[PDB]
Design a protein around this ligand. Structure first.
Ligand SMILES: CCCCCCCCCCCCCCCCCC(=O)OC[C@H](COP(=O)([O-])OCC(O)COP(=O)([O-])OC[C@@H](COC(=O)CCCCCCCCCCCCCCCCC)OC(=O)CCCCCCCCCCCCCCCCC)OC(=O)CCCCCCCCCCCCCCCCC
Ligand SMILES: COC1=C(OC)C(=O)C(C/C=C(\C)CC/C=C(\C)CC/C=C(/C)CC/C=C(/C)CC/C=C(/C)CC/C=C(\C)CC/C=C(\C)CC/C=C(/C)CC/C=C(/C)CCC=C(C)C)=C(C)C1=O
Ligand SMILES: CCCCCCCCCCCCCCCCC[C@@H](O)O[C@H](CO[C@H](O)CCCCCCCCCCCCCCC)COP(=O)(O)OCC[N+](C)(C)C
Ligand SMILES: CCCCCCCCCCCCCCCCC[C@@H](O)O[C@H](CO[C@H](O)CCCCCCCCCCCCCCC)COP(=O)(O)OCC[N+](C)(C)C
Ligand SMILES: CCCCCCCCCCCCCCCCC[C@@H](O)O[C@H](CO[C@H](O)CCCCCCCCCCCCCCC)COP(=O)(O)OCC[N+](C)(C)C
Ligand SMILES: CCCCCCCCCCCCCCCCC[C@@H](O)O[C@H](CO[C@H](O)CCCCCCCCCCCCCCC)COP(=O)(O)OCC[N+](C)(C)C
Ligand SMILES: CCCCCCCC/C=C\CCCCCCCC(=O)OC[C@H](COP(=O)(O)OCCN)OC(=O)CCCCCCC/C=C\CCCCCCCC
Ligand SMILES: CCCCCCCC/C=C\CCCCCCCC(=O)OC[C@H](COP(=O)(O)OCCN)OC(=O)CCCCCCC/C=C\CCCCCCCC
Ligand SMILES: CCCCCCCC/C=C\CCCCCCCC(=O)OC[C@H](COP(=O)(O)OCCN)OC(=O)CCCCCCC/C=C\CCCCCCCC
Ligand SMILES: CCCCCCCC/C=C\CCCCCCCC(=O)O[C@H](COC(=O)CCCCCCC/C=C/CCCCCCCC)COP(=O)(O)OCCN
Ligand SMILES: CCCCCCCC/C=C\CCCCCCCC(=O)O[C@H](COC(=O)CCCCCCC/C=C/CCCCCCCC)COP(=O)(O)OCCN
Ligand code: SF4
Lengths: 115, 83, 175, 156, 318, 70, 98, 71, 105
């Protein structure tokens, strides 16, 4: 109840601020003022052209790594089991595999951006 | 055991971050086995009463089962108070 | 009858699924998937699944960000489409919305069976168990039992992640 | 009356708000831009007046034409002037921007920036000292103070 | 009565952001051997009010090529999330007492990045697109390290509740136990808020204001308040996490004063760092985090998993 | 000054003072002035519900001592 | 069955149809795949929480993990496809016939 | 004590519900009041739809969402 | 097909999770522990073919505990008749249902 009330209040305040910003001052917009912004001249192409990604492999590796934290986050509760040896071994095994994957990607020049 | 000294010196001169991380990881891997306090942690974990201790029906042949919480029988956490 | 909070959330979930399922210029598909993920996190929050919802929401946000980057890099056109910029996209969106509305009305008015079984209605609060819990959280204990009970699951999951890293390296190697 | 007092007070508040915070666009051309830099130097510290540079025209209030305006540059200056949201003010600095100055008779120099954009304040010199430009900015502040928009709207 | 609490949490944060900006100008000015704003009011105290009134009485323009809906939505999302992710903070009593405050804070911070991305894409300009791509790269660089650092630090708390961090460090600061993680977390916080030397999303000298280059008057102001609220909030979170204060249940004013002072110290440190260093490059930041921060973090995480079991000091509240 | 930065900081500090204390006060004003109860688990919620049920006025913070059992 | 279960099932069906329609791009189909994963995750966690299956609580998390792999896998292939044609259009994948 | 109290509170609600059902369904031709839906004859915990089924909306809301929504 | 190496080597790789009544952490019970236990004990040993006929009552009870379809039908009928009687004007609900009646610790 309280959390959605907070979210509604924040959204309403932001929307009201936008409304005041857009309806209070005097608006005088013509075709030249609203043109797309380059430094001083007209853009040659378009901003919707494909834009090369030199770190795509790092992006996919981040996609895979973002679930290692998902697996590791329950550790504060996992550290409360009776058999701490098995839990410790499993946690260390998971972290060792994470480190080994990172090392493999490091040595094979996977962290270097494309030229 | 001679070339490893030069390799360690070169690694410490060039990339100390990797050396420190490997040392910390190795310490965290080996030391818990040798620590005598791990069993204390396991016992402390076992001694936490999350759920209700269900009483046992008396059949007249349970000398080690206390008849009351204050009776001398049963597990004791006197070792925990000194820890 | 109790404000239908779970019902409204599930309806918004289905609406977002329709929105991103019409394939409108994946930027907006990503927006729809984010909305659906957040609303589903709220839904499972309402059932007591705090960790799973936050976890699902957190994982999806990270994934979507990578995807936004990938559609900017490789899946963009001169005039990106939107739900009202194409006849086929608008048709799919309206068809999905109408199907959702029709099913909701038919299930609310009558106990109609569509695919699996009949309809119940009367809110989802009824099935909630009245049993109480202790000083722990059942969800937290069940999830944390992964490291003590699920050794096999941890092993196979770690091997899968390592093999996945190797596999993406090999695939995007090139040659 | 009552409405006259209200519009006068509101106009005073708006004028003070616009005057006390002028954000000139980061835009220099020639010699006079060095004196523009020296205005921001610790000795004069234009920032203490609320005057702070901003790069994007959309987030700028004032343009300071500091240097010669050549024919090849005039379209760019006009374009970046048009993209500044209103209200906007132009301050002409130096003889080159005022009326051509040393290169008045050149084939490739616009004889004054007032042919391209409307100018509010003219700062004379070659180059004007940082004190002269600070005086010009303060004069622009006074000119903004004198303006009466809401009072004129009420009497319409 | 709860709406009173909501407003009493919202409005003072906005006022603090407004004056925070004034403080930043003055601190930078003195450091740069000048004065900073001292003319608008007594010691420049009226400068933020003049800035806000100027920005909200100025014409906002929507570019012709821009996608209007996303362009409008992005600043609203930014400001809403900046105000929202303040609630679970215990000072010393949180407004919303949640079982997992840290995970919610992480999720909202991860959602915060999307507003920057949407604004950059909807502006339909090359500089805005480059800024959005830089934001994507920055998030990819810092997110995993930030999460693992948080997990490693919280392993000694016993749970993700933010209120428990007050009693975890009742006797000694946590910074005396995990100071390497403290420095790494500080750098990650610097990179998360898009602050110098990691302010690559804006890039004044490179991308001419970057992603918000097309935001003229009002939405640009909202972006600024969102960024500064994130600054203050994240520094307060760091102060709570690492520099724990004394909480007396009969007088929370002492804890509130101490926490506010520590937050102000961290914010002034942020301004100091901005004034002191040149800017990174958006690939060197990724290399630094993955190459140096990640290996150390993994090692530290292993060490902090092993240490409570090694020394038999596992925290309560499973 | 260098001390002219102190006023603005103070104002900011004052602003950062407002939320915290206010929240505390509100809690007290809404809970009989005794530090609003924290219910993280189901047992604490059950205790709160029992207090509300036996209070007789439908407020959990109205505590009943020994005088309510004769 | 309550309305929530049927709504989740319909969300899965809609995502499956969207994947099977294959409009123009390849990234949209991947988005539909992630949507199907999300719907399955929500259904599974609702079922697990309703019946208080404590040990099954780690079942969804493992699910999520393999989701990433699938997603990662798809993205990898997408990249290579783009590198062959400059566009991820499914129309270009027609070299092999039946 | 809490456990003892809970059993009594649960039993009373069922009795209150059973009596109300016996009053309501007296005119339905083929309805057996208090009829179980299970073939077994042991005790089954109430579904919490059987406890607060005939009560008002705020009671239901406090019963099912009271703990989760309390922050 | 099913190469049962767990039974041969006695490993218990994934059998701890198959059913709902098998050693949950902290002894937290499933919602249908009794019904599942009864059905498992009934069907164990006889075989799959017989268990679908002789242990049908236990499985029906287990399914009813899982989905509560019959209970929801009964409750919906009860509330439908109650609201119809209220609309006609013969029911007059009691104070405890209204909430006027005092709660018990
Ligand atoms: C019914 C199904 C559900 C309906 C949802 C809302 C109802 C839609 C009605 C119109 C909305 C947009 C307005 C419009 O069409 O243009 C007007 C007009 C267009 O004039 P124009 O410049 O000549 O046209 C430009 C071109 O035509 C081209 O201009 P364009 O490219 O910008 O137009 C495309 C635009 C137009 O829209 C359409 O094409 C069709 C509308 C269908 C949208 C539904 C798709 C499903 C997406 C996911 C589910 C969303 C929630 C559904 C639940 C709703 C119930 C609560 O599509 C969108 O942008 C959709 C985005 C809306 C989603 C907002 C959610 C916020 C996400 C934040 C993160 C979530 C956190 C976790 C939780 O623009 C204006 O008047 C200026 C203001 C517009 C923006 C203001 C704020 C956005 C509008 C509110 C959206 C709802 C938020 C809650
Ligand atoms: C010789 O060769 C040449 C070059 O080579 C050397 C050149 O280079 C060159 C070009 C160079 C010229 C153009 C000159 C350029 C000058 C120099 C290069 C540098 C000079 C100064 C620099 C830019 C450094 C500036 C850095 C300083 C520290 C200034 C401070 C930095 C700021 C950007 C930070 C502050 C940010 C702003 C002030 C905005 C803050 C305002 C906020 C948005 C408002 C507050 C938010 C509100 C909305 C809050 C509202 C909330 C409310 C509740 C508040 C209450 C309101 C109610 C009414 C109550 C030329 C021409 C040249 O010839
Ligand atoms: C800061 C947080 C707290 C703030 C709390 C207050 C929230 C304020 C709400 C935000 C809006 C404030 C904007 C202030 C100006 C009002 C804008 C608009 O609504 O008014 C006029 C809109 O009016 C329409 O033009 C005509 C309205 C005719 C229809 C009547 C409305 C229905 C009522 C029926 C009539 C019966 C009598 C009306 C009185 C009840 C302006 O038209 P327009 O010129 O484009 O806009 C330019 C405004 N300028 C000139 C100031 C620059
Ligand atoms: C036997 C066949 C050997 C050849 C085949 C090898 C191929 C399979 C890979 C390894 C086999 C995994 C078998 C492990 C099954 C887990 C059960 C057993 O090991 O006991 C566990 C003990 O686990 C131990 O830690 C040993 C497992 C550690 C394995 C090390 C990882 C390396 C495996 C190699 C493949 C991994 C990927 C590649 C790595 C380089 C848990 O017992 P316990 O906790 O008392 O009881 C739990 C139940 N409670 C909670 C009710 C009390
Ligand atoms: C959302 C809640 C807020 C709503 C709006 C209120 C905002 C706060 C108002 C801020 C008040 C300060 C304005 C004036 C500051 C005093 C500075 C004084 O010096 O100004 C003089 C004159 O100031 C103006 O005359 C006063 C303007 C104030 C107008 C009162 C309006 C009150 C606010 C009402 C808002 C809503 C009205 C109700 C209807 C809705 C001229 O000085 P100036 O030459 O420059 O500078 C000298 C430079 N030196 C020092 C180097 C020599
Ligand atoms: C629950 C308590 C919360 C408190 C939170 C902490 C503290 C917050 C307060 C923030 C401090 C703001 C700095 C104020 C410095 C004092 C400036 C003052 O001395 O200068 C005067 C400014 O006076 C202004 O009236 C004071 C404005 C300061 C308050 C605005 C802060 C915005 C929040 C509330 C806005 C409502 C404004 C209502 C008054 C207009 C001079 O202006 P003025 O006397 O005119 O002279 C020009 C007119 N003449 C030419 C005819 C003589
Ligand atoms: C969150 C911190 C910042 C707070 C944001 C909101 C601050 C609000 C402060 C209000 C200050 C007063 C604003 C008055 C200026 C409005 C803009 C303006 O100057 O418009 C001038 C314009 C001139 O038009 P014309 O002369 O007819 O046309 C000539 C061109 N052909 O005059 C007007 O129409 C405006 C008339 C008054 C507008 C109403 C303002 C009353 C106060 C409402 C404030 C609402 C706050 C909530
Ligand atoms: C007064 C009537 C207000 C009606 C506003 C409806 C939208 C609209 O069309 O306004 C148009 C106007 C531009 O039109 P112009 O021609 O440029 O100027 C006209 C004024 N002279 O655009 C706006 O102002 C849009 C204002 C925003 C509307 C508020 C609704 C936004 C909802 C956002 C929801 C998403 C929040 C996401 C965060 C939540 C996550 C937890
Ligand atoms: C936007 C993203 C939504 C994220 C919501 C996160 C809220 C949260 O985590 O608070 C959890 C909080 C604390 O509970 P516990 O942690 O279990 O401990 C105390 C209880 N014993 O639990 C709750 O309060 C849950 C209440 C319902 C959740 C709110 C659901 C709303 C989600 C946002 C939907 C927004 C509208 C949907 C469409 C968007 C665009 C139109
Ligand atoms: C089985 C134990 C595992 C647990 C511990 C480890 C936990 C996690 C830590 C490791 C994370 C991944 C490590 C990745 C290794 C990458 C190596 C590499 O190839 O990088 C080289 C650079 O690194 C090297 O120099 C090669 C390896 C150097 C030594 C690495 C560690 C060796 C052992 C050190 C510690 C020894 C034991 C501790 C003794 C302490 C002293 C008493 C490439 O150089 P670049 O930076 O990419 O480019 C430079 C040109 N522009
Ligand atoms: C007996 C068992 C004990 C176990 C051991 C545990 C302790 C381990 C001891 C070592 C810990 C060291 C931690 C270091 C953290 C990482 C630092 C690092 O290595 O990165 C730096 C880089 O780091 C930076 O430069 C970041 C710059 C950012 C500057 C920001 C401001 C500077 C500092 C301001 C004050 C910091 C305040 C910290 C605490 C704040 C309070 C919370 C190196 O990078 P390169 O020089 O490029 O080398 C690699 C290429 N060959
Ligand atoms: S006016 Fe003089 S100093 Fe200024 S740009 Fe022209 S020639 Fe250079």
């Amino acid at each position: 109840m309280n959390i959605m009330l907070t979210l509604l209040t924040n959204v309403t305040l932001a929307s009201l601020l936008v409304l005041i910003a857009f309806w209070l001052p005097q608006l005088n917009a013509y075709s030249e003022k609203t043109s797309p912004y380059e430094c001083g001249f007209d853009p040659m192409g378009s901003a919707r052209l494909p834009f090369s990604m030199k770190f795509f492999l790092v992006a996919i590796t981040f996609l895979l790594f973002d679930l290692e934290i998902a697996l590791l986050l329950p550790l504060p509760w996992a550290s409360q089991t009776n058999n701490l040896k098995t839990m410790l071994t499993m946690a260390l095994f998971l972290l060792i595999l994470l480190a080994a994957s990172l090392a493999y990607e490091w040595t094979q020049k996977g962290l270097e951006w494309a030229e | 055991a001679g070339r490893i000294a030069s390799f360690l010196k070169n690694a410490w001169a060039k990339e100390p971050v990797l050396v420190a991380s490997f040392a910390i990881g190795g310490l965290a891997i080996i030391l818990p086995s040798l620590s005598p306090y791990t069993n204390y942690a396991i016992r402390i974990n076992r001694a936490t009463p999350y759920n209700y201790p269900v009483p046992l029906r008396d059949d007249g042949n349970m000398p080690d089962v206390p008849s009351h919480p204050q009776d001398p029988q049963g597990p004791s956490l006197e070792w925990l108070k000194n820890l | 009858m109790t404000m239908y909070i779970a019902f409204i959330l599930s309806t918004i979930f289905v609406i977002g699924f329709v929105g991103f399922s019409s394939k409108p210029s994946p930027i907006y598909g990503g927006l729809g998937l984010i909305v659906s993920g957040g609303v589903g996190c709220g839904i499972v929050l309402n059932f007591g699944g705090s960790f799973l919802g936050l976890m699902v929401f957190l994982i999806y946000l990270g994934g979507m960000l990578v995807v936004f980057g990938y559609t900017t890099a490789m899946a963009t056109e001169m005039y990106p489409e939107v739900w009202v910029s194409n006849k086929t996209v608008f048709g799919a969106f309206v068809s999905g919305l109408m199907m959702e509305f029709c099913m909701v009305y038919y299930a609310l008015k009558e106990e109609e069976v569509e695919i699996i079984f009949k309809f119940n209605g009367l809110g989802d609060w009824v099935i909630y168990d009245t049993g109480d819990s202790g000083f722990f959280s059942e969800e937290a204990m069940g999830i944390a039992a992964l490291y003590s009970y699920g050794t096999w699951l941890v092993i196979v999951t770690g091997w899968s992640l390592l093999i996945g890293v190797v596999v993406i390296m090999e695939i995007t190697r090139g040659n | 009356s009552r409405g006259e007092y209200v519009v006068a007070k509101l106009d005073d508040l708006v004028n003070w708000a616009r005057r006390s915070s002028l954000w000139p666009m980061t835009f220099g051309l020639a010699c006079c831009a060095v004196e523009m830099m020296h205005m921001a130097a610790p000795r004069y510290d234009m920032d203490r007046f609320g005057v702070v540079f901003r790069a994007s025209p959309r987030q700028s209030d004032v343009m300071i034409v500091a240097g010669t305006l050549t024919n090849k540059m005039a379209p760019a200056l006009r374009k970046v002037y048009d993209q500044m949201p209103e209200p906007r003010y132009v301050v002409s600095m130096g003889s080159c921007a005022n009326g051509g100055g040393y290169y008045h008779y050149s084939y490739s120099v616009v004889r004054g920036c007032d042919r391209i954009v409307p100018v509010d304040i003219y700062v004379p010199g070659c180059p004007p000292t940082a004190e002269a430009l600070l005086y010009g900015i303060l004069q622009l502040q006074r000119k903004i103070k004198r303006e009466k928009r809401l009072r004129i709207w009420y009497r319409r | 009565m709860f709406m009173i609490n909501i407003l009493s949490l919202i409005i003072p944060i906005l006022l603090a952001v407004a004056f925070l900006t004034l403080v930043e100008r003055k601190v930078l000015g003195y450091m740069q051997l000048r004065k900073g704003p001292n003319v608008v009011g007594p010691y420049g105290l009226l400068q933020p009010i003049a800035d806000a009134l100027k920005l909200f009485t100025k014409e906002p323009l929507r570019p012709a090529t821009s996608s209007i809906s996303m362009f409008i939505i992005a600043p609203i999302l930014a400001l809403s999330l900046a105000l929202t992710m303040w609630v679970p903070l215990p000072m010393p009593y949180p407004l919303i007492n949640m079982n997992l405050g840290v995970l919610f804070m992480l999720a909202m911070s991860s959602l915060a990045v999307y507003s920057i991305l949407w604004s950059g894409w909807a502006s339909n300009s090359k500089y805005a697109l480059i800024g959005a791509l830089r934001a994507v790269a920055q998030t990819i660089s810092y997110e995993v390290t930030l999460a693992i650092i948080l997990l490693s630090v919280l392993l000694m708390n016993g749970s993700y509740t933010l209120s428990t961090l007050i009693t975890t460090q009742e006797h000694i600061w946590m910074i005396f136990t995990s100071w390497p993680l403290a420095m790494m977390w500080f750098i990650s916080t610097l990179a998360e808020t898009n602050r110098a030397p990691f302010d690559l999303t804006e890039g004044e000298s490179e991308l001419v204001s970057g992603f918000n280059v097309e935001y003229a008057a009002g939405p640009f102001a909202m972006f600024f308040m969102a960024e500064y609220a994130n600054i203050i909030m994240m520094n307060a979170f760091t102060a709570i996490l690492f520099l724990g204060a004394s909480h007396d249940p009969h007088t929370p004013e002492l804890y509130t004063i101490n926490f506010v002072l520590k937050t102000l110290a961290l914010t002034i440190t942020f301004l100091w760092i901005r004034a002191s260093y040149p800017r990174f490059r958006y690939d060197q930041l990724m290399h630094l985090l993955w190459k140096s921060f990640l290996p150390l973090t993994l090692a530290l995480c292993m060490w902090h998993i092993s240490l409570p079991i090694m020394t038999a000091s596992i925290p309560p509240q499973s | 000054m260098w001390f002219e930065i102190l006023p603005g900081i103070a104002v900011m500090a004052a602003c950062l003072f407002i939320p915290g204390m206010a929240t505390a006060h509100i809690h007290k004003f809404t809970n009989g002035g005794k530090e609003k109860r924290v219910a993280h688990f189901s047992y604490q919620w059950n205790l709160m519900e029992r207090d509300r049920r036996i209070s007789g006025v439908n407020r959990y913070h109205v505590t009943k001592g020994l005088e309510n059992i004769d | 069955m309550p309305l929530v279960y049927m709504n989740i099932i319909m969300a899965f069906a809609i995502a499956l149809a969207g994947l099977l329609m294959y409009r123009s791009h390849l990234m949209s189909s991947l988005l539909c795949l992630e949507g199907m994963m999300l719907s399955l995750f929500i259904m599974s966690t609702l079922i697990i929480l309703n019946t208080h299956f404590t040990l099954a609580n780690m079942m969804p998390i493992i699910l999520l993990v393999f989701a990433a792999c699938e997603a990662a896998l798809g993205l990898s292939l997408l990249v290579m496809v783009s590198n062959t044609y400059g566009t991820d259009y499914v129309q270009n994948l027609n070299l092999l016939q039946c | 004590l809490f456990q003892a109290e809970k059993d009594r509170r649960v039993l009373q609600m069922l009795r209150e519900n059973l009596e109300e059902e016996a009053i309501i369904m007296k005119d339905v031709p083929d309805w057996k009041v208090g009829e179980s839906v299970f073939h077994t004859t042991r005790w089954v915990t109430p579904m919490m739809g059987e406890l607060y089924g005939l009560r008002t909306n705020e009671e239901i809301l406090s019963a099912t969402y009271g703990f989760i929504w309390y922050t | 097909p099913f190469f049962d190496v767990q039974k041969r080597l006695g490993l218990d790789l994934d059998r701890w999770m198959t059913i709902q009544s098998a050693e949950q952490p902290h002894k937290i019970p499933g919602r249908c522990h009794a019904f599942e236990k009864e059905w498992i004990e009934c069907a164990h040993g006889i075989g799959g073919i017989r268990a679908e006929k002789e242990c049908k009552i236990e499985f029906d009870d287990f399914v009813e505990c899982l989905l509560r379809q019959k209970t929801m039908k009964r409750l919906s009928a009860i509330k439908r008749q109650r609201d119809k009687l209220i609309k006609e004007g013969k029911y007059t609900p009691p104070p405890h249902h209204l909430g006027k009646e005092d709660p018990r610790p």
